[model samples]
Target: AGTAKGHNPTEFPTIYDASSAPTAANTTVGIITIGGVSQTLQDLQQFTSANGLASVNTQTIQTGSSNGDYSDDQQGQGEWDLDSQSIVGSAGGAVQQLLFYMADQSASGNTGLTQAFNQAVSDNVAKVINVSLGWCEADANADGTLQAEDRIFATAAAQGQTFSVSSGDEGVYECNNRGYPDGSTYSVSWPASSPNVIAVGGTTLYTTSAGAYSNETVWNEGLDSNGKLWATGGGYSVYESKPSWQSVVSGTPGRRLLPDISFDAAQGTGALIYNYGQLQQIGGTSLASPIFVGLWARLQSANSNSLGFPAASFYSAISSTPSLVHDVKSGNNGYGGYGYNAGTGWDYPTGWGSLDIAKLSAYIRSNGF
Candidate 1:
């Protein structure tokens, strides 16, 4: 009945002394969300101060020409709370500000999701963006040769805006009717499968009694009480071609490989977040993506915000300074008994694996990426 039942915010940060990294005070992390949030909560207020010196400025922008606010959608409100709390908790004082791009369920029908990304990219304030929602790749529309979403993501990368997106929690069958995973076909989630963005998968993290890093495996819990598959999404993108950064991966890999990275996503090992005015234990690639967004923003801030998109840097780091990552070498994402397995080196389940924040920061500094 209390927050202590779940992992604390400091656990992952303590794993690599992330506190050693530069504070993200000069950086802004934007969250692509569907609804409004309560900014007055005690937990949120701690980081949302307007003191300007050590403030985590939290703001909201309405998308789709709407007059509505957080109260417009109950479901969206809870999601916004979960997303915001998770991001700020991981980031701590590292990040200076958070801009929430909200689009109600009705607004989403007007392409608000795409509009949210467009607005965040155009604002040019947030160096890193977090997208915790996804759909099957087949749902995307193509504008002539490439998918429209691909074009947007590519543009963002070129603009030096890095998007950390959830790879999905439905195993390899991302399109399997929302986690039922009949396994009749294989598909990956959109946005996460896009080569231009850093696709973050999931892991079941194990820590010592003192919260030190022990080991991790691909997050794959067979099914929930509702018979829904509980696992991380990965596999090859049917539409995207492999980018040069991903050449380090094994296999032919002509198509884009999903989950360029991973983080803690198991509900059992999930972190506590404030939702609906209560402490809720939540987990998913949704949580994993924001963890990365927050940490990456800190890395960017440490470099005077000069670091561009993080995909290439991550791939290069794993190739040269493999110690910067944990390199998950166990478990599988085969929900309904058909998916990829975690192996040595790069694999679909957890790409280069989880990060050692301090090591990663130092590597970026030395390599000057």
Candidate 2:
């Protein structure tokens, strides 16, 4: 019951040449990998060698994990591998440095993710950070740790650090994958829903055969790998209220409607990533976060470290200069079951919708960010 838009799901990252993206030579992005990372780095080197990209400078700091005895954990290496390559590759290796902070994959509690984020800020590791991992809000709540995470994020915002987070690939029902089909109404993912983050969602990106980037729509690929419905996760929050930035958005209004923006994360139209020696097409809002991480790096690099929290500036731009961002007027992230739909202005799936970076860069300059 939706009209189609965006790129073919089965496309490669090369479909869109983000060459114009700002070369953040002066920028360093910090990545928090609780489960550790290495293979992703090896693949990154291979991608750079073949593409003649500038080298990706990185440093790893470790924390305890139930996995690998608090050693390098593989539980989420593939995830962050998706993180590093998507960003380091797309930005043309423009980022001056990368600081990877590894924390132990905890069975529960806040994990060391909070500390890593704070460390990135205090130690001056990077101005922008990418978080590809998330905790089910419900579990985080039970463990009494999510609120603690939010507190840390607020400090990051105050310090002018932008945490680009993937809204989630779990669709409207975030808890469905976490043992809760019976009752998981507020299955929102944490950190993404936290008011301080620049939560990015997924979309099916469309490109003209002429090779120009075009429109996009909410990502909701039906049934992935054993009848599992895959889509972007977005909705009202049980923990946060509407931030001043997103208050004007039109939809099934809630306190905090996520993802503030979105990019191509649809399978097939998914980003092409070099995972080890294999060429894999990975799609998820996870890919979308890095795209924006790179975008934020570009924007932040230009601002001379003054653009601390980007949400306010982004919302200001989207509201006043609508032309700077594309208003995704179609598609749904499986919200019919929850009484939400994609429509003109804004919706649950792709918040203010996607940005037209070319235009956004222009307006972002004068938004008084």
Candidate 3:
């Protein structure tokens, strides 16, 4: 059995190279999360130092305090540590500064997540925003927050702030979010479906003993064995219109497709995170989102601060520089035959597939970016 040893930049040097590519020393990235997820300076310093990350800056901003409804006691503290460590830990010292915005505290049983996102954008705070949270379209629409979130995302698009959000982990059973698997019909997650935000999907990464690239497949957990497993979330958006950039893609032309890109999100081959005091192995599109955000920070810096709403340009690159990304041709997000399938050249399961950091950075810098 391959016990989880957890991940780091030394193990995943491609992430380090991409993260270190940043020239702009003042780039900042914002993350919006909820709950009592707090990490002390000592915790970060210890991890960063051990992980080869230089002394980085991290701070927390709040929209509203939670009433312990969304979480209790630690309330997503693991999430907090996981996201920060994924960048500063796994990416070999990326981002000049990391700003965290926690906003699960909505008054009177309501959510103020929009306020958190607005706060990040209205201030033009960070070059990129990483939000690893989402809900099914059915729920968000019912909560009346779908339209509201769309407007906020539009604001981000206009302001040139890129949002890299998790697509989900429930596979084709996204409609049964919160892990209630009914092996139900196919569906997609919100915020990931939001046209402006960059939906990051998940993948099962395989690598060389030295941690060099071996290959990857669509993240469909236990799909072949149990036939009932948690898989990567993907599919066409139920409410979003397919943008023009997506015209190159041939699927449900009118609706937005998911996961502009994917990254390692399988818990088995996950990254190591420093929790309150313990080292844990965790992965999901949540890990992928921030990891990509940190890389985007470097990309933003390398691009001289002009890589706004990168999905369109990225899609073009898939064809222009085919080597820039890995195309996962085999694997399925559906439980057996119930969800999205992965194929060559742009499918919902893995979208444009995982990035090849070296090629991606080189291509962007040399090309029109």
Task: Tell me, by lDDT, which candidate is best.
Answer: 1
Q: List the residue pairs that clash in candidate 1.
A: 24-94
Cα displacement (Å) at residue 13, model 2: 9.8
Best by TM-score: 1
Quote the positional error of residue 140 for candidate 3 in Å: 0.5
The alpha-carbon RMSD values of the candidates against the true structure, listed in the order shown, are: 3.5, 3.6, 3.2
Indicate the worst ten consecutive residues by lDDT in candidate 1.
46-55
| Residue 155 in model 3: lDDT | 88
TM-score quality measure for candidate 2: 0.88
The residue-by-residue lDDT of candidate 2 on 1-369, one tens digit each, is 222333221222333333555666678888887755677677778766766777778887654443433445553656776787777755546688887877655534465676666666667658888987675777777776777778778888888788888888777777766322323354678878888888888888777666566677788876555655578877767778888878666544567778888877887677666776676777788888887777667666766656778787777777777776667776766633642456676667887777666566666566557
TM-score of 3: 0.90
Tens digits of per-residue lDDT, candidate 3, 1-369, equal: 123335763354463345346532457888787754445345567677776656777777766553423332273777767677775543446567888776765444335687778778887878888888887877887877888878888989988899889998888677764444555467888889998999988888776665556677888765434444567878888778888989888646599999889888888777877777777888888887877776677677777778778878888889667788878777888764567789978888888888776677888768755
Off by over 4 Å in 1: 1-5, 39-43, 46-55, 66-72, 108-110, 142-146
Task: Write down the TM-score of every candidate.
Answer: 0.91, 0.88, 0.90
lDDT per residue for candidate 1 within 203-237, as digits (tens), equals 88887666677888889878878877889998889
Order the candidates by lDDT, highest first: 1, 3, 2
